[PDB]
Enzyme design. Structure first.
Site, mmCIF file in Angstrom:
data_model
loop_
_atom_site.group_PDB
_atom_site.id
_atom_site.type_symbol
_atom_site.label_atom_id
_atom_site.label_comp_id
_atom_site.label_asym_id
_atom_site.label_seq_id
_atom_site.Cartn_x
_atom_site.Cartn_y
_atom_site.Cartn_z
ATOM 1 C CG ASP A 111 -1.801 1.221 1.323
ATOM 2 O OD1 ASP A 111 -1.911 1.929 0.312
ATOM 3 O OD2 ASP A 111 -2.395 1.468 2.406
ATOM 4 C CB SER B 208 -2.072 14.170 -13.608
ATOM 5 O OG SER B 208 -2.516 13.962 -14.937
#
Length: 330
Positions: free
Chosen positions: A35, A199
């Protein structure tokens, strides 16, 4: 040194991925959820409340000759999905795919929430975010990657998650046969403890690319792709019959639909998520309403590039002095 381990989806929907981990001496092998959005290595154990264990493999520290109770240490974590767990702490030897760390904090669960009990395939979590998020008190502990880093050939790990198929976590090297083209690297902020990056935009299907900064985290422990409501609305508007359902808890779509792809930007590069990756199947057994793999982050407080996005790429988690993230197509 290096390590290389196969990671396997837990079910037919790729709801999560498990990776075998050797703990203790002799080894006790547990299947852990790696994770990159948290920083605790915790396991189901011989100390876990019996009624809260249902099919998981447990770590029994008393059977490990290298286990040592970390005196006074406790831990307690709550995850973004509302699940939680807590307990005490041992140090022990932990190996992943041939890479061994001695003195790793292994957090032994005394209590786990129902979500964990109900998932027989996940024996615990292995956190790979930054150690500043580790919950051990009163002395915070380091992640497996943090402990291994100095010994690694290169201070990196890579995530290569499969679509309906096994993939690979590598530690200490970049497998140049595992991706196509080049790896594009992008800046990381560690200010919130996450692999947080920006992004450069998105496209829906064969649509034009929208240049827009989307700050979010690379999180292997989250199933879906959570993005701003504007972006998510633009995606689902291209699917006839798709709608946001408050009763279900997100966007649903007719299971008869063909989903468009979703592209996200990494610098000037582009990662394409095929439409099929965005299908999470019937909302309930036998339903013709299917759950979407792209959902709004509104009210989470952060955008999350979860498995739906990451499995479309070969992803480099670069733990150099100034960390960065790398993405390649594959």
């Amino acid at each position: 040194s290096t390590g290389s381990a196969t990671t396997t989806p837990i079910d037919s929907l790729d709801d999560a991925y498990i990776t075998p981990v050797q703990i203790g001496t002799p080894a006790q092998t547990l299947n852990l959820d790696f994770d990159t959005g948290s920083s605790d290595l915790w396991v189901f154990s011989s100390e876990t409340t019996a009624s809260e264990v249902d099919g998981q493999t447990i770590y029994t520290p008393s059977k490990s000759t290298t286990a040592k109770l970390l005196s006074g240490a406790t831990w307690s974590i709550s995850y973004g999905d509302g699940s939680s767990s807590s307990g005490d702490v041992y140090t022990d030897t932990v190996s992943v795919g041939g890479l061994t760390v001695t003195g790793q904090a292994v957090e032994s669960a005394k209590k786990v929430s129902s979500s964990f009990t109900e998932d027989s395939t996940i024996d615990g979590l292995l956190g790979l975010a930054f150690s500043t998020l580790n919950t051990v008190s009163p002395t915070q502990q380091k992640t497996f990657f943090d402990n291994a880093k100095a010994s690694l050939d290169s201070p990196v790990f890579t995530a290569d998650l499969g679509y309906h198929a096994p993939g690979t976590y590598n530690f200490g090297f970049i497998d140049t046969t595992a991706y196509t083209g080049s790896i594009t690297y992008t800046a990381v902020s560690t200010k919130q403890g996450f692999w947080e990056w920006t992004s450069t935009g998105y496209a829906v299907g064969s649509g034009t690319f929208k240049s827009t900064s989307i700050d979010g985290i690379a999180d292997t422990g989250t199933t879906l792709l959570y993005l701003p409501a504007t972006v998510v609305s633009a995606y689902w508007a291209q699917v006839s019959g798709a709608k946001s359902s408050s009763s279900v808890g997100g966007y649903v779509f007719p299971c008869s639909a063909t989903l468009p792809s979703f592209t996200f930007g990494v610098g000037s590069a582009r990662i394409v998520i095929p439409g099929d990756y965005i299908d999470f199947g019937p909302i309930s057994t036998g339903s013709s309403s299917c759950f979407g793999g792209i959902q709004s982050s509104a009210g989470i407080g952060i955008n999350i590039f979860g498995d739906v996005a990451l499995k479309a790429a070969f992803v480099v988690f670069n733990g150099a002095t100034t960390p960065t993230l790398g993405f390649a197509s594959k």
